[PDB]
Amino acid sequence: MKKVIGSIEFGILSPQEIRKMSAAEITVPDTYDDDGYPIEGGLMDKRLGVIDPGLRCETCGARAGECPGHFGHIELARPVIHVGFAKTIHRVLESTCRECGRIKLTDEEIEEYMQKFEVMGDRKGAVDKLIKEIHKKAKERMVCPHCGAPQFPIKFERPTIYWELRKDEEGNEYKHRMMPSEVRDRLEKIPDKDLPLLGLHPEKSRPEWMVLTVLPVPPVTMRPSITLESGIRAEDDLTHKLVDIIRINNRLKSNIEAGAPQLIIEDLWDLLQYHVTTYINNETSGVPPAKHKSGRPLKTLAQRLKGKEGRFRGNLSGKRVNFSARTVISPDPMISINEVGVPLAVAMELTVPEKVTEFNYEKLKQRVLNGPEKYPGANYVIDPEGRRIRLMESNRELIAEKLDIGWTVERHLEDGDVVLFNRQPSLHRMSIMAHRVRVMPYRTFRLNLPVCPPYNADFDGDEMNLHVPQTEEAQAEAKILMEVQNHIISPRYGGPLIAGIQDHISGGYLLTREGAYFTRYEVEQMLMFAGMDVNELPEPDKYENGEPLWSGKTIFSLLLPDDLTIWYRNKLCDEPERCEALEKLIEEKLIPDPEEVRKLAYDGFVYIQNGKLLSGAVDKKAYGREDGKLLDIIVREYGVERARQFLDQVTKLTIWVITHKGFTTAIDDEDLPQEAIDRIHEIIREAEEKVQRLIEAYKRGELEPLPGKTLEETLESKIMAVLAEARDNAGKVAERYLGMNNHAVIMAKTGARGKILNITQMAAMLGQQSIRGKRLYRGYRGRVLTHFKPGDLGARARGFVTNSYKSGLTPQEYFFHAMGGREGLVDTAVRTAQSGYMQRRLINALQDLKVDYDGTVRDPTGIIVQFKYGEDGVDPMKSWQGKTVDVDRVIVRTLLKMRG
């Protein structure tokens, strides 16, 4: 059968294990000869694997691409210290007797630590603290309790140098260098019983194994060799490092065999130690990194695992995948929110493997007969034996007549297929959702507009990735869990995320506003466009010139369910006295007459009774993101499919309404009368006079300092407050003369796009430009620009733009606005990286937490983090405004349903 990995046990490889697992001994530094054949005994020996296609492995007998590679070994002439175990070696040497070999602890202390180790074993932090305490206790001891032999302090010098402070005959203290052979001999005397006290395992990690005597050379598959376009081989950095190691080891062995003096032996030993240390880690502190001939700092085994481009993050936690596509996205309101537009070229390339069954034999046979060049067709066919056959014109008929039950047909992407649609960066779980394939002739992806806010995607050149699941389990998981309609409500705040946007909101406002009426032709056309299942028109609301007319509220009410009742205040409510009468009428009777409601109907108060929009207008509070009460109620009380249908119908209806009525903005939308401009100029002049008076008072010393601040900050705060008040007054003056008939004002007030402040800047004035919360000061001595006098603290000299976008900015005001915009762009480009790093840290901290079947949240070890998730066991996605149950809404809905 098949087996899976249950657990992984780590340790230090013994020299005997390295020798036994080795397939060959490497002694020749050279890799390839002049003819290009591998050299026997070299680093590219065929016993370690094969890279070239024509080569055959002497250990496996297989060809390139399927030989896994085999490890070698190098017999070092002298032992060397592993740089990754240097601190542990120093700690163990400090914590152990030099000649006796036992740990410098009493028997009672050893027993006490042995019993304490069993109690604290689950938490690795407790074990680390116990190890540190044992090391600290054993370090201060200068006499071994087991034998009474005197001890000397051991000094550790980076990277792998150990100094022993021995005492001379006259009492002088001199440093004695401990060679790796002496260190290994000292480590060999430690018994197995003291190893748990030192944090080592008797059978897995012996202390003497931390001093390397046999170096395992990696297989050639781990360090592949390529050839360039000019025929010159490009060896890996590990290959060059191993070449240097082999050369130095051979030179050291030859010098040892030649009886060289000890001075040469120490130099060669140090060179070999440096080479081994750089091979293990080329970024070790205090070590000059190994450099290539061209000057390139080589990357080694340590660099291949850590970092963004390491083995873990770059190849294990994340990697490139097959059956994926990426292209520019384009809007498509005609498709549903559950659908994605797939190009025909993309569909004809990406394939889904479908097994031949009894109920789909004819379809797959037709797909095979069509071939790869005829849509809908197939590209590959897999027999039950498991081999893959490519489909072409010559053999498409032979395969088609040979098709049977159990075959696999890699047909092209068809309508209704489930694929993954993703936009980067993936900040939340809504960044990847499963859509339905819709095949289109052009070369762009198509995404429905309400699905843009979950992706945070616009259409100014955005590109998105498409993934096609290949297994039945993955397809089922995508279809059940990751469908678009299943994630309308955002789990972050428990509100709508897949909601209407600017044009939908504007069209809804245009349709549902007071005085909006449509002819029979317009109503029928918008009903056909929206796909609503309406066969007969309702009774006309009024007649004009002998022609029937339908109110927009009547057309909008066809979308709502017949048993839906809700009332609230939208963003268009500017006269609360009109909403108060409606609220009192609703409260008094709880079933108000529809004629009575329409008599005192107000656009700012939306009231839906039994699915009929009796009052109010559609805005961002209707079905907008994070504010749509109607959409949120529809999701919670009618399911996700009904909500998806409602969204698909209402988006098309509002799009038709806004398209044929005519929505536009012009240069006269920001126009203001002369009296408004005069008032704005008067406000600006008054603010400038106030700033000048404050400056004069500060110069005369009459300014009262604020608590906790000196005169300069007090004056700056007063000036900024005055300028902000002036900007607010100018904005109010501009808002006074901009009525509801303005399309830009409609867009700002309905929440479709933009703000009132955006219209204020173009109409009245820009205001004060500031960076880092302070007025502009960077420039010359005492002045931002030379055009102003030195020492001028006035508003105009510090970044107060009196002009507006329509009036035209002065060059100084242009420079100030450029400073502000640069500050904003820099702030965004700096904040993004910190936010991403914090998100990665949080993800890695809370990756393993999940809710068990009993409602508890536990770590993989088993420690209970929460006895109930959220202390109430309620999903934030299904929570009503952060609460457990919306009691008032339930009571009101039940009472209305039973009394209606």
Partner DNA sequence: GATCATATTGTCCAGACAGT
Partner DNA sequence: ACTGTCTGGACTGGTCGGCGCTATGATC
Partner RNA sequence: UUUUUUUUUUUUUUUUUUUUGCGCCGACC
Residues making up the binding site for Mg(2+): 458, 460, 462
Question: Contacts by 776-785 with C-beta closer than 8 Å and gap 24+?
Answer: 776/816, 776/819, 784/816, 785/812, 785/815
Binding site members: 57-58, 60, 67, 70, 97, 100, 144, 146-147, 458, 460, 462
Q: How far is the CB of 55 from Zn ion (least distance, A)?
A: 10
The C-alpha atoms of residue 836 and residue 840 are separated, in whole angstroms, by: 6
Q: Is 827 near RNA (CB under 7 A)? A: no
Q: Which of these segments, 306-314, 491-499, 615-623, 685-693, binds DNA (CB under 7 A)? A: 306-314
d(C-alpha 317, C-alpha 311), whole Å? 8
- Percentage helix, strand, coil for the chain under 3-state DSSP, each rounded to 5: 40, 15, 40
Among 145, 224, 611, 754, binds RNA (CB under 7 A): 224
Q: How far apart are CA 547 and CA 519, in angstroms?
A: 8
In the bound complex, what is the minimum distance in angstroms from residue 301's beta carbon to Zn ion?
21
Which range in 103-111, 293-301, 538-546, 652-660 contacts DNA by CB under 7 A? 293-301
Q: What span, in angstroms and rounded, lies between the C-alpha atoms of 382 and 876?
A: 46
- What CA–CA distance (Å, rounded) separates 752 from 506? 6
Binding mask 400-429 for DNA (x = CB under 7 A): ------------------------xx----
Minimum CB distance to Zn ion smaller for 146 or for 642? 146
Please report, for residues 80, 717, 723, 751, the alpha-carbon distance to residue 766 in angstroms, rounded to integers and kept in the order given. 71, 19, 11, 22
Q: Does 59 bind Zn ion (CB under 5 A)?
A: yes
Tokens of 720: 């900024």
Contact 706, 653 (CB under 8 A): no
The reply on whether position 228 binds RNA by CB under 7 A is yes
- The least distance separating DNA from the CB of residue 464, rounded to whole angstroms, comes to 10
- Measured from the CB of residue 324, what is the shortest distance to RNA in angstroms? 16
Please state at what angle helix 629-661 crosses helix 502-512, rounded to 10 degrees: 80
Binding mask 752-771 for DNA (x = CB under 7 A): --------------------
Distance CA 123, CA 129 (A): 10
Question: Which residues participate in the annotated binding site for Zn(2+)?
Answer: 57-58, 60, 67, 70, 97, 100, 144, 146-147
Task: Give the C-alpha separation, 437 to 338, whole Å.
Answer: 9
One of 208, 244, 339, 619 touching DNA (CB under 7 A): 244
Q: How far is the CB of 460 from Mg ion (least distance, A)?
A: 4
The burial class, CB within 10 Å (0-12 / 13-18 / 19+), for 260 is middle
Nearer to Mg ion, 23 or 447 (CB): 447
Given the complex with Zn ion, which of 60 and 287 has the nearer CB atom? 60
Residues 448-477 contacting RNA, CB under 7 A: 457-458, 460-463
Question: Is residue 127 at the binding interface for Zn ion, with CB under 5 A as the rule?
Answer: no
Please, which of residues 308-367 interact with DNA by CB under 7 A?
308, 313, 318, 320, 326
Interatomic CA distance for residues 753 and 738, integer angstroms: 17
From residue 17 to residue 36, what is the string marking binding to DNA with x (rule CB under 7 A)?
Answer: ------------xx---x--
Instruction: Write the CA distances from 536 to 527, 561, 716, integer angstroms.
Output: 11, 18, 68
The DSSP output letter for 312 is: I
Nearer CB in complex with Mg ion: 463/848: 463
Minimal distance, residue 312 CB to DNA, in Å: 11
**C-beta of 271 vs 697, nearer to DNA:** 271
**Residue nearest Mg ion, Cβ-based:** 458
460 binds, among Mg ion, DNA, Zn ion, none (CB under 5 to 8 A by kind): Mg ion
Contact 307, 313 (CB under 8 A): yes
Closest listed residue to residue 604, CA positions, set 627, 580, 625, 584 = 580
Name which of 167 and 806 has its Cβ closer to Zn ion: 167
Name the segment binding DNA (CB under 7 A); options: 63-71, 75-83, 287-295, 341-349. Answer: 287-295
DSSP letters for 72-104? -BEEEEEEEE-GGGHHHHHHHHHTB-SSS-SBS
Please report the sign of the dihedral spanned by the C-alpha atoms of residue 350, residue 352, residue 356, residue 361. negative
Comparing CB distances to RNA, the nearer of 55 and 694 is: 55
Taking CB under 7 A as the binding criterion, the range among 63-71, 267-275, 369-377, 388-396 that sits at the site for DNA is 267-275
Question: Dihedrals φ, ψ of 589, to 5°?
Answer: -105, -35
Closest CA to 504 of 732, 630, 333: 333
Q: Which CB, 780 or 837, lies closer to DNA?
A: 837
With respect to Mg ion, which residue has the nearer C-beta, 304 or 423?
423
Is residue 507 within 8 A of residue 653, CB to CB? The reply is yes
Query: Buried (b) or exposed (e) across 519-546, using 16+ Cβ within 10 A?
Result: eeebbeebbebbebeeeeeeebeeeeee
Residue 87 interaction partner, one of DNA, Mg ion, Zn ion, none, beta carbon < 5-8 Å per kind? none
Region near DNA per CB under 7 A, out of 55-63, 288-296, 379-387, 390-398:
288-296
339-343/432-440 β-pairing:
parallel
Residue 59 partner contact from Mg ion, Zn ion, DNA, none using kind-dependent CB cut-offs of 5 to 8 Å: Zn ion
Element (H, E) at 605: strand 605-609
> Segment near DNA (CB under 7 A), from 99-107, 254-262, 304-312, 485-493?
304-312
What is the total count of residues that contact RNA (CB under 7 A)? Answer: 23
Residue 116's CB is within 10 A of a number of other CB atoms, namely 14
What SS3 state is found at 865?
A: strand
Mask: binding to RNA, 691-710, rule CB under 7 A, as x and -?
A: --------------------
CB of 60 to Zn ion, least distance (A): 3
- Strand pairing partners for 549? 542
Which partner from the list Mg ion, Zn ion, RNA, none does 49 bind, CB cut-off 5 to 8 Å by kind?
Zn ion
Which residues make Cβ contacts (< 8 Å) with residue 354, sequence separation at least 6?
360, 364, 408, 409, 410, 411
Counting every residue written for the chain, the total comes to 900
Alpha carbon distance 872, 891 (integer Å): 21
By CB under 5 A, residue 462 contacts Mg ion: yes
Near DNA in 839-858, by CB under 7 A: 840
What phi, psi does 285 have (nearest 5°)?
A: -70, 140
CB of 220 to RNA, least distance (A): 12
Q: Which of 12, 43, 80, 97 binds Zn ion (CB under 5 A)?
A: 97
271 sits near RNA (criterion: CB under 7 A): no
Which of Mg ion, DNA, RNA, none sits in contact with 70, Cβ below 5 to 8 A by type?
none
Spatial separation of the C-alpha atoms in residues 526 and 834, rounded to whole Å = 48
Size of the site for Mg ion (CB under 5 A): 3
Per-residue contact string for residues 472-501; x = within reach of Mg ion by CB under 5 A: ------------------------------
Does the protein bind Mg ion through residue 458 (CB under 5 A)?
yes
Among 146-154, 474-482, 585-593, 722-730, the segment contacting Zn ion (CB under 5 A): 146-154
Footprint of Zn ion on this chain (CB under 5 A)? 49, 57, 59-60, 67, 97, 100, 144, 146-147
Footprint of RNA on this chain (CB under 7 A)? 51-53, 64-65, 224, 226, 228, 234, 236-237, 296, 299, 309, 423-425, 457-458, 460-463
Footprint of DNA on this chain (CB under 7 A)? 29-30, 34, 132, 158, 228, 232, 234, 243-244, 247, 271, 274-275, 283, 285-286, 288, 290-291, 293-295, 306-308, 313, 318, 320, 326, 424-425, 463, 832-833, 835-837, 840
Footprint of Mg ion on this chain (CB under 5 A)? 458, 460, 462
